[PDB]
């Protein structure tokens, strides 16, 4: 439930969290980079 003060204009309620998104830059080779990309709670697959 979200209750606020009256708004004059159609203003956005910018709702966030403290959600984690961590990336490891993997590299087994000199020349190419593996991008281990994952938003942790919001499944990328």
């Amino acid at each position: 439930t979200f209750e606020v003060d009256p708004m004059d204009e159609p203003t956005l309620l910018y709702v966030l969290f403290e959600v984690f998104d961590v990336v490891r830059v993997h590299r087994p080779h000199r020349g190419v980079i593996e991008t281990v990309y994952l938003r942790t709670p919001f499944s990328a697959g």
Partner: peptide, 13 residues
């Protein structure tokens, strides 16, 4: 070669 599980698996070409 990649990040997780490196293993040899070959077929004849």
């Amino acid at each position: 070669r990649p990040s997780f599980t490196p293993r040899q698996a070959i077929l004849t070409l």
